[PDB]
Design a protein around this ligand. Structure first.
Ligand code: 3BD
Ligand code: NMN
Length: 312
């Protein structure tokens, strides 16, 4: 296989393998059987081994990691990563809804999402290419964990469209991976992780990307910070649009027209809670219309258009 034949074949394989990987990791719905992916994967690895100069950032062989950093660099957030006000009872929720109605002057629809137990991260894309990944940190400055995020399978290295955007989401570790990880630590005489959140956070502080690639972390994107060319005028639309451009979003989302539908939603998943492959510790209620979120604005620490109902 010449260099010219390999240069061309590599792009075809990356193109196809990344599509398969998208259906598998992002949609949780693989089209082909693993052995189909494996052969093609092995074929690209042969080509990459023959011509290491054909290796690209979006090549699926990169998910295994390799870089070891001396430490993390500061990662300023152009747009703040605010906190969330909390509600602990049915009353707190209706109390919040009344304040929202008092400020807006009419009933408002809420986009409801599960409060994923993990670590909030920000992703930056230039012309569809993944260029930066950062932890939330203190809200205005986090850590630059770009190299580690490259190993998180559901994080696209190249979007379905060459657009430039900044999105924020939750990076977590599924219950079963959490369980196996602790057994592994127990076997090695290490201290186990108290919960999945700590397992995720601790994994993302790891400097050896080879290790982080094995931590089996996943993601759920919940917001667009810098829209770029994106349309979306409501949170519900933002979530569908995050999915359209190639991000992993949470299927359990729901748009509720009333505060009563929101409570029914809370109760619904309050039961289903234990049946999810990941831990949640509540529900995040968001004023759907961006025009309305803008009206409500933010307090000094959190938006006045959202509240997180924390489970008891
Ligand atoms: C965009 C806004 C600001 C409304 C927002 N902020 C969130 N969080 C704030 C507190 N952040 C935080 N992280 C660590 C320590 C303290 N606060 C972690 C992100 C959200 C968290 C989740 C989730 N957990 O599934 C979610 N579906 N939507 C969110 N939406
Ligand atoms: N059927 C598919 O489309 C698909 C896509 C990506 C990974 N996989 C599987 O995931 C596992 C890990 O593979 P990678 O290390 O290449 O990510 C393998 O067992 C592989 O077969 C299957």
């Amino acid at each position: 296989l010449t260099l010219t034949a390999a240069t061309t074949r590599a792009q075809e394989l990356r193109k196809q393998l990344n599509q398969y990987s998208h259906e598998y990791y992002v949609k949780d719905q693989p089209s082909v059987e693993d052995y189909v992916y494996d052969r093609l994967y092995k074929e690209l690895v042969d080509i990459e081994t023959e011509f290491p100069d054909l290796i690209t950032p979006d090549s699926p062989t990169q998910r295994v990691g390799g870089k070891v950093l001396s430490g993390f660099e500061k990662a300023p957030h152009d747009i703040p990563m605010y906190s969330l006000n909390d509600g602990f009872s049915k009353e707190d929720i209706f109390a919040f809804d009344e304040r929202v109605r008092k400020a807006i002057g009419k009933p408002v629809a809420y986009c409801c999402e599960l409060k994923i137990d993990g670590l909030a991260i920000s992703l930056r894309y230039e012309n569809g290419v993944f260029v930066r990944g950062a932890t939330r940190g203190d809200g205005t400055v986090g850590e630059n964990i770009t190299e580690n995020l490259r190993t998180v399978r559901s994080v696209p290295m190249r979007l379905t469209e060459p657009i430039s955007v900044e999105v924020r989401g939750e990076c977590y570790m599924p219950k079963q991976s959490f369980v196996a990880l602790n057994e592994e630590r127990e076997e090695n005489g290490q201290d186990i992780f108290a919960n999945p959140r700590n397992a995720a956070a601790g994994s993302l502080r790891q400097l050896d990307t080879k290790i982080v690639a094995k931590r089996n972390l996943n993601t759920f994107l919940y917001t667009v910070a810098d829209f770029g060319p994106m349309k979306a005028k409501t949170q519900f639309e933002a979530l569908e649009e995050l999915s359209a451009i190639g991000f992993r979003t949470n299927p359990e989302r729901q748009l509720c027209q009333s505060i009563d539908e929101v409570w029914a939603y809370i109760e619904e998943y309050h039961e289903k809670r234990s049946t999810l492959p990941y831990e949640i510790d509540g529900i995040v209620i968001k004023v759907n219309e961006f025009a309305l979120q803008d009206e409500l604005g933010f307090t000094v620490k959190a938006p006045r258009w959202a509240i997180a109902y924390k489970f008891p």
